[PDB]
Design a protein around this ligand. Structure first.
Ligand SMILES: [Zn+2]
Lengths: 1365, 56, 218, 24, 30
């Protein structure tokens, strides 16, 4: 019961390899732990000495080996595809047709664009040829295929690690890669290791004293280097990332010869070689230089604006840092002088290279292409120990002022939302100034806070937030690991390396089995665990780090706590996010150049307004928090939530734990059965942790951070905007200037104000305990680079490669589903298009990997046995290019594998997947001249799906191909819940008749005479059946499904066999379309022009058996590409559509025009994507409860929806009654009084703009949207008192994105068009009548069962009080 | 007694002034001291089990 | 009539109570007293196990004065805390650029190894360090790089514009033989004329122990 | 109307003095 | 009730003097 992951997902920890070498007779010293030298060998790998294949492999190798840190760069160059590998068919054979597909897909893309109107004017006559050359001459092509063969072999090897099939042998030109279960031996020539002055390879310096390495390696020419299969996996990930990056750069040069936004592939290749050379000389330490790629790219970007003294100070500090690091790690390592000059080529290129800002921002996202250092447990505990045990000096006056501003910001947030002060129960004498404002019931302005600041300390008030606000119970089941309890803490280390057997076993360390095993689980019971300080009980004083993976820094760790303390943490995070943390909104994204001048000036009122920021690292705050600092804030959070000791838990628990790393093969040093109860401190473990842990109480710490930022704002007096994302916190200082000032002078002064704010904030936080290192924080005037999107003076820079290089034929899909893998590639392709101005590079990379996934799962599927041609057990005859290419052209919602929809280049969220998919399929078939193959591909045999599926996936069709494994997984979780879930509030939730109830609820929500799937889904989200579907949907890993202690215990057919059946059926569906076809539907669908009709009659025929003839409305929207046709215009010309129409003919259209102004351009105004204009980006309850619970809020929402939808019928209340009876103890009339349900309008249209889950974002960079004006007033009647299927927000996204696409490479001054009309195609749009739902019956189920279930119910919804108006 | 009022005003003003010139060093027992305090208040016994990190 | 006097007393007293109540809340029940703190300093190296309160000047003293009472951790803590007092808007973000770091920074821009420009650089960093004008030099270099110039142009302009290089003569470098200069340095060198300058004249002059002297040129 | 005010001060200072009392 | 004001002011001065006395015992003087 196991499944090796396809991609690297675990930290590269090589301590286990140290035992392997000892069994084989070799020698290695990966682990810093002396225990692994002389511990008893695990019986699993003790048998290597009995192996014949391993002995014959290492017979001609010295006892010495070398760390794989230094050999990884050698393998990345020495290894090629020219040798013999025991994999058939080789991945290299596929190449010849993968390219044939890639080119064909590129061709489709071009064809699509040709009919949408977004084709580049300049046509590269050899475009296909260039693609073919680029793909062939890529220098990591053959290496990538070879590394996929090695990954295939090592996956098979891991799956059957105990069987005889584990060993595999590969002989390249000069490298021998014999491999065991999850240990890979590499045999490499000594000659190709760089030497040191002493005459031994740089790898040997760490482990062997010279004259002992050369005596061990005496006559031998080859040496071995034992490494875990994870290193083979990450080298495969490196090589495929390098391949994507060089292919992407080359195809960009093909589509944009003048200046492509990606870094030139030659420079990137040189960077790769420099980095590998550096790694081959230094080791894992070399990453302490590779790590400076991103900061040096950010420096080099910033210097691309007007040069201000503090602009170069970023690059100077980074350059100094790089030199100091390079000297420190090479001081004690004897490098020959040649090597000293050449190890520096990496950062020397990073400094010299001159590139446009966009190129640098793409290069920024290659930082992980050199690898990830081999983490040690020891080097990752020293880091936290030095920052979490250090004593800190705090100025109370600053802690006092930060706390008062904390209260001030919570009072201010309460005032704005609730509209008045909270009931001040404290003495009015203690607040002489504040009580006057409270009496007038108005909040004091920001200038006068300075004198009244201390008064805030004395404000008191009753609880200001509810203790029951969690709605997604999945947080308590969300899959993860938790520390085992203290009595069995050492159960995580394996007994042979541990050296004694752990006296107490542990039941499980998994959170889902723990959640199901907890009988008395409830939110008030989590609180009673907290308030009663149960987390200080002996069994729960445990804590255990775990090295984070894919990190270039020497090991960075994330904490794990015992399951009950973990529930307390999740509750505190949920409580803060829904309540208090909303008082310090740190998501406020500020880009000053785009925002309107007036709103900006009134925003900085505390003329012109200028904003300059400085970005600090909030990640290092966590270790520096101290309880002397955090006590007031924590006490206040408790008093603000009406609890005691809840938000307090970390500083009471962590300081009293035995911090260590739960590393399977590296226990804390000197650990024995004698001192298991009182472990000794050592380099691996340390006792007192007076501090924070990363992630834990992220919501509280960010709140104290925004409190310090507001304290600096009060003191200094500038308008501060605080925004945090990931690890960095960017504080934008807005300073107001008089209008009659020099623009060059005001920028300088604004940057100076930012540096003054930074100095004050340094003083503040220094007093609070958090040292803001002034060297590594920089004052950026105009470069906003925190967060998802980087801006340079408001021109959005592209970071495409961070998602485009993650594409791969193998991904972590459920089982090894092709659809899951293809979907991942489709998602990476949508995102990468979004965040760059180049279409074809990422299209080529996603096509390449789509076909390569198909083939690689076709032969080498990991679930099926070796040599199991999945193409043969389904099709009987072998899958050819033809069948795959046609199964990749049928979009997934019709049932197929096409997840690369060209339309997603125009906009992200799609109005209707069926209509868009149909339009795509139609255009493809028109290209390849197989129109007649249309209807048959569409019309399939509808599957057998219940109404539950329809409600869970409204927009879809009832086609078995159009189905992801989620249903199957949810059925397995359901089975494991009904079988061995002892949780009380889950058994009550998942009672015996669960399935019957979900079916009844679903048939009902769809029993309305006009059926509206989306409304069904919306209510269902609030009904208890939606809560069951949320709890069930927690399984998304293949290893968890296939290896859980609570999943595989079922007495039915084993999971693996069911999975094989499902795989083979799915393959049958996808790749045999003639078989699974329905002729009736094919006759129904004949001779129908427009996609919307096809989609509606196909959608009604699929769900025929659930609809039973009742019409389905609110589920088909036109495919905007066919709805609107584009007519570009040269200046001083009118479009033919507007001329043919006398008055009414083709009149209605969306007008787009260019703006001549250019607010900002970097590097110049050559490309539309480089410049931004000034344009805008895009275009009641009677009694409101003061602290509504999640259940009450969902109840009100549910009631509001039901009333609004069923407004026509007079029995609305009789429809609402059952649902509210499972959720609140209110009469329907009471809730109706609490409902804001006073508005009315067209149900369908107002359901799509504001009630649809998708926000309809654009998939194209915002730089071109500001350069355009998009007027929808010329649509005539269809312009906004009218209702239509037109989705206005996507018409704007489509108009902008289309204009961007057509001119993404052309020079701006050469654009021969200034105006665009998106005219309405008559056939494919029509006015949607306003209707209303009319239920003719009521849900007869007695949902009152959930009265006891506090996850579902809400016993006393009016506890926190009520307010007027 | 206006003399007592002025005297108390002056003593308080001096204390507030001397507050801005304070510096404290975070200790190794603050978390444990607040834990003993929160456990004695809530349950009336000392925190159970092995000693906490820095007990008095 | 004490209404005004009692109102002022209320303002100051309420402020004092607020501040000192937060101080109580932060420093828990195990706060070490002044006497207890310094006893613990005395009989043990480390600080006492619990927050201790000091006046700024109290520990400013006995840290500026050589004394064994303050633990190393307390001295380090206080130095860190007072390090941020010096920070202003001018001081924040300015790197400390030494002669060696300036040489390494300027090398990396120069192509090749051992060129005449490398010798120019290690001369410039020598005149700069003596004249305490490194910051001006580097500012000049960076500005030259930014303004569309190669590192060779940056060095020659950094020798023109920086005032320490107004008329200073090239330094003499003793070498045992003419082969000590690198091969890349062999290209451009000529016998030294009388009274040279560093750029209007010649980069630098290597006087050999056997009389010979050859000067470099850009 | 001073009584409350001054009484209110005794309602706080004393209490916080009691706090410092536990420390010493 | 002016005698009440004298008594409570005496009490308030007493407790502020006590707090000053406790301060100098916590905080190091010089
Ligand atoms: Zn028109």
């Amino acid at each position: 019961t196991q499944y090796p992951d396809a991609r690297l997902s675990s930290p590269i920890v090589l301590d286990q390899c140290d035992l392997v070498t000892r069994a084989c007779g070799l020698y290695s010293s990966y682990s810093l732990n002396p225990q692994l030298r002389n511990c008893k060998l695990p019986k699993h790998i003790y048998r290597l000495k009995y192996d014949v294949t391993v002995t014959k492999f290492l017979s001609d190798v010295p006892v010495a080996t070398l760390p794989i840190d230094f050999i990884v760069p050698v393998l990345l160059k020495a290894l090629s595809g020219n040798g013999f590998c025991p994999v058939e068919p080789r991945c290299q054979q596929f190449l010849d047709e993968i390219i044939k597909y890639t080119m064909q897909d590129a061709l489709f893309l071009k064809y699509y664009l040709k009919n949408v109107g977004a084709q580049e004017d300049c046509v590269d006559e050899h475009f296909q040829e260039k693609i073919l050359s680029s793909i062939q001459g890529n220098e990591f092509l053959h290496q990538m295929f070879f590394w996929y063969d090695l990954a295939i072999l090592t996956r098979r090897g891991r799956l059957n690690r105990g069987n005889s099939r584990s060993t595999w042998f590969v002989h390249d030109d000069l490298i021998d890669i014999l491999g065991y279960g999850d240990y890979v031996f590499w045999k490499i020539p000594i000659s190709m290791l760089p030497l040191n002055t002493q005459g031994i390879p740089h790898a040997a310096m760490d482990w062997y004293q010279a004259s002992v390495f050369k005596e061990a390696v005496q006559g031998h020419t080859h040496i071995v280097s034992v490494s875990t299969a994870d290193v083979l996996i990450m080298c495969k990930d490196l090589i495929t990332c390098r391949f994507n990056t060089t292919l992407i750069s080359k195809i960009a040069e093909i589509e944009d010869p003048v200046c492509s936004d990606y870094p030139n592939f030659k420079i990137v290749s040189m960077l790769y070689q420099s980095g590998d050379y550096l790694l081959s000389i230094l080791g894992s330490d070399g990453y302490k230089i590779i790590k400076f790629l991103e900061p040096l790219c950010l420096a080099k970007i910033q210097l691309c604006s007007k040069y201000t003294e503090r602009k170069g100070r970023f690059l100077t500090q980074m350059h100094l840092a790089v030199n100091h690091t390079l000297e420190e790690i090479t001081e004690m390592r004897a490098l020959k002088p040649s090597q000293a000059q050449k190890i520096r080529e990496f950062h020397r290129t990073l400094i010299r290279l001159e590139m446009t800002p966009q190129q640098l921002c793409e290069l920024f996202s290659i930082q992980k292409h050199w690898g990830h250092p081999v983490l040690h447990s020891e080097t990752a505990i020293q880091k936290v120990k030095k920052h979490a045990t250090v004593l800190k000096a705090l100025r109370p006056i600053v802690i006092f002022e930060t706390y008062c501003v904390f209260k001030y910001s919570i009072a201010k947030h309460y005032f704005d939302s609730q509209g008045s002060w909270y009931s001040v129960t404290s003495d009015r004498n203690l607040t002489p100034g504040l009580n006057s404002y409270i009496k007038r019931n108005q909040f004091p302005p920001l200038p006068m806070i300075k004198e009244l600041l201390w008064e805030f300390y004395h404000l008191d008030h009753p609880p200001l937030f509810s203790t029951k606000i969690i709605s997604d119970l999945s947080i308590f089941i969300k899959d993860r690991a938790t520390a085992v309890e203290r009595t069995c803490w050492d159960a995580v280390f394996e007994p042979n390396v541990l050296g004694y057997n752990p006296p107490h076993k542990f039941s499980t360390k998994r959170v889902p089995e723990q959640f199901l095993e907890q009988e008395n689980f409830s939110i008030e019971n989590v609180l009673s665990y907290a308030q009663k300080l149960e987390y200080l009980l002996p069994q729960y004083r445990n804590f255990s780090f775990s090295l984070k993976e894919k990190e270039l820094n020497v090991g960075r760790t994330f904490g794990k706590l015992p399951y009950p303390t973990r529930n307390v943490q999740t509750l505190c995070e949920a409580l803060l996010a829904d309540g208090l943390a909303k008082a310090f909104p740190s998501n406020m994204m500020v880009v000053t150049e785009r925002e309107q001048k007036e709103s900006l000036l009134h925003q900085a009122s505390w003329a012109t307004v200028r904003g300059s920021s400085f970005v600090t690292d909030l990640e290092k705050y966590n270790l520096a928090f101290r309880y002397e600092f955090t006590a007031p804030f924590i006490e206040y959070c408790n008093r603000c939530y009406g609890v005691k000791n809840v938000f307090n838990w970390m500083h009471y628990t962590i300081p009293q734990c035995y911090m260590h790393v739960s590393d399977y093969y590296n226990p804390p040093h000197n650990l024995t059965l004698e001192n298991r109860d009182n472990p000794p401190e050592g380099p691996s473990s340390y006792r007192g942790h007076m501090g924070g842990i990363e992630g834990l109480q992220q919501k509280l710490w960010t709140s104290i951070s925004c409190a310090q930022i507001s304290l600096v704002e009060i003191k200094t007096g500038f308008k501060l905007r605080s925004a945090v994302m990931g690890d960095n916190q960017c504080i934008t200082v807005l300073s107001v200037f008089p209008l009659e000032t020099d623009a060059d002078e005001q920028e300088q002064s604004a940057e100076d104000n930012a540096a003054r704010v930074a100095a004050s904030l340094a003083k503040v936080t220094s007093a609070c305990g958090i040292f803001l290192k002034p060297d590594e924080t920089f004052v950026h005037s105009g470069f906003i680079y925190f967060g998802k999107k980087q801006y340079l003076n408001g021109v959005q820079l592209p970071q495409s490669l961070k998602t485009a290089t993650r594409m791969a034929p193998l991904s972590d899909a459920i089982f090894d589903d092709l659809q899951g893998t293809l979907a991942s590639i489709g998602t990476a392709f949508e995102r990468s298009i979004s965040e760059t101005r180049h279409i074809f590079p990422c299209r080529i990379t996603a096509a390449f990997h789509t076909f390569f996934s198909v083939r690689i799962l076709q032969y080498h599927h990991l679930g099926f046995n070796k040599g199991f041609d999945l193409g043969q057990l389904t099709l009987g005859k072998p899958l050819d290019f033809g069948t795959i290419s046609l199964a990749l052209a049928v979009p997934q919602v019709l049932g197929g594998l096409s997840f690369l929809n060209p339309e997603k280049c125009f906009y992200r969220n799609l109005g209707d997947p069926v209509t868009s998919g149909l339009f795509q399929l139609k255009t493809y078939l028109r290209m390849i001249e197989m129109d007649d193959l249309f209807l048959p591909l569409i019309a399939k045999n509808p599957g057998n799906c219940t109404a539950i599926d329809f409600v869970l996936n409204p927009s879809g069709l009832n086609v078995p191909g159009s189905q992801d494994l989620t249903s199957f997984l949810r059925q397995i979780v359901r089975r494991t819940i009904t079988l061995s879930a002892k949780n009380k509030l889950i058994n009550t939730l998942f009672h015996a008749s669960a399935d019957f109830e979900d079916e009844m609820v679903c048939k009902w929500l769809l029993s309305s005479t006009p059926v509206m799937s989306r409304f069904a889904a919306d209510i269902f989200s609030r009904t208890p059946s939606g809560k069951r579907l949320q709890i069930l949907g927690y399984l998304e890993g293949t290893r968890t499904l296939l290896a859980s202690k609570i999943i595989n215990n079922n007495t039915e057919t084993p999971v693996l066999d069911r999975l094989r059946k499902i795989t083979l059926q799915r393959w049958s569906l996808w790749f045999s379309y003639l078989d699974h076809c329905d002729n009736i539907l094919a006759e129904a669908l004949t001779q129908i022009t427009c996609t919307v009709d096809l989609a509606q009659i196909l959608r009604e025929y699929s769900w025929a058996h659930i609809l039973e003839g009742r019409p389905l409305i609110g589920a088909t929207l036109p495919c905007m590409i066919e709805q609107f046709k584009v007519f570009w215009l040269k200046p001083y010309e009118q479009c033919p559509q507007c001329s043919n129409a006398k008055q009414p003919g083709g009149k209605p259209f969306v007008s787009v025009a260019v703006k001549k102004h250019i607010v900002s351009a970097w590097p110049n105004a050559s490309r539309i994507s480089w410049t931004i204009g000034d344009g805008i980006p895009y275009i009641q309850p009677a009694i409101k409860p003061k602290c509504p619970s999640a259940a009450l809020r969902e109840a009100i929402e549910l009631a509001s929806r039901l009333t609004w939808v069923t407004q026509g019928s007079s029995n609305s209340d009789l429809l609402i009654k059952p649902f509210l009876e499972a959720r609140v103890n209110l009469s329907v009339q009471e809730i109706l009084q609490m409902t804001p349900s006073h508005y009315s309008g067209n149900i369908v249209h107002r359901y799509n703009d504001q009630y649809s889950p998708h926000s309809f974002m654009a998939n194209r960079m915002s730089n071109s949207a500001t350069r355009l004006i998009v007027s929808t007033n010329t649509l005539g009647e269809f312009s906004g008192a009218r209702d239509s299927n037109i989705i206005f927000q996507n018409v704007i996204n489509y108009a902008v994105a289309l204009f961007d696409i057509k001119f993404r490479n052309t020079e701006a001054t050469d654009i021969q068009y200034n105006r665009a009309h998106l005219h309405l195609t008559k056939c494919c749009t029509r006015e949607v009548p306003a209707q209303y739902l009319t239920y003719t019956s009521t849900l007869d189920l007695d949902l009152t069962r959930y009265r006891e279930n506090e996850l579902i119910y809400d016993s006393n919804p009016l506890k926190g009080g009520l307010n007027c108006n | 007694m206006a003399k007592t009022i002025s005297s108390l005003n002056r003593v308080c003003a001096e204390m507030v002034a001397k507050y801005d010139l304070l510096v404290m060093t975070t200790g190794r027992a603050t978390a444990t001291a607040a834990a003993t305090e929160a456990y004695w208040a809530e349950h009336g016994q000392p925190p159970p089990g092995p000693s906490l990190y820095e007990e008095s």
